[PDB]
Amino acid sequence: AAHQLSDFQRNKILRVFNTFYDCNHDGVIEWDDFELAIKKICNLHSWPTDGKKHNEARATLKLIWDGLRKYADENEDEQVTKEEWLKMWAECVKSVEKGESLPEWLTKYMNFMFDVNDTSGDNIIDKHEYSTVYMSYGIPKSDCDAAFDTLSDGGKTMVTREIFARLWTEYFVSNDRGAKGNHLFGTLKL
């Protein structure tokens, strides 16, 4: 009585491990991966290392890693493995299906990524801002452009902070292959 992750769900959650959290592709998340993530973003947007954007990104990522460790690092080595990661997500999905909200470190990350996408600062991610960011993570442009149209409902919805936040939740927990949120980090062929 209860339940595991479906193949669908597990693979969506491993995809994000591999592409966005494990920046040195060694199979585990560590503070070292976050430092890398920080360099990557500074390079993308041309932020100087000792600036306030950089320093605010670092501070935010520290809180996020602190919350992630608290949630997932069961053997307390300051390293989160795919094992630790999936075990945690199993409980984060269930808790979400029962009304609870996602963990605070996760919402923090979502809001931080929204901010990273929305370089114009107008509270809207546009198609160019979007592919600029996900293409930097190895997502093909054609899967960025298709995903954007899906996410914005072919332009009927503005991808604001709140819309990004809802889509974000749906990516990680939805078991519906027709959900829009499935394509938040590039088109999934389904």
Mark the binding-site residues, compressed into ranges: 22, 24, 26, 28, 33, 73, 75, 77, 79, 84, 118, 120, 122, 124, 126, 129
Cβ proximity to Ca ion, 73 vs 143, nearer residue: 73
Tell me the CB-side half-sphere exposure of residue 24, using CA atoms within 13 A: 12
Cβ proximity to Ca ion, 85 vs 172, nearer residue: 85
- Cα angle 71, 179, 103 (rounded to 5 degrees) comes to 15
Instruction: Please give the full DSSP string across 38-56, using - where no structure is assigned.
Output: HHHHHHHHT--TTSHHHHH
Distance of CA 46 to the CA centre of its chain: 21
- Residue whose pair of structure tokens reads 């909200």 in the numeric block: 101
**Could you tell me the smallest distance in angstroms from the CB atom of residue 132 to Ca ion?**
11
Cβ proximity to Ca ion, 86 vs 179, nearer residue: 86
**Could you tell me the smallest distance in angstroms from the CB atom of residue 16 to Ca ion?**
13
Q: What residue numbers does the annotated binding site for Ca(2+) cover?
A: 22, 24, 26, 28, 33, 73, 75, 77, 79, 84, 118, 120, 122, 124, 126, 129
Task: Give the footprint of Ca ion on this chain (CB under 5 A).
Answer: 22, 24, 26, 33, 73, 75, 77, 79, 118, 120, 122, 124
Please say whether the dihedral angle defined by the alpha carbons of residues 80, 115, 170 and 133, taken in this order, is positive or negative. negative
**Could you tell me the smallest distance in angstroms from the CB atom of residue 6 to Ca ion?**
25
Tell me the CB-side half-sphere exposure of residue 114, using CA atoms within 13 A: 20
Cβ proximity to Ca ion, 83 vs 97, nearer residue: 83
* Cβ-contact 185, 19 below 8 angstroms: yes
**Could you tell me the smallest distance in angstroms from the CB atom of residue 117 to Ca ion?**
8
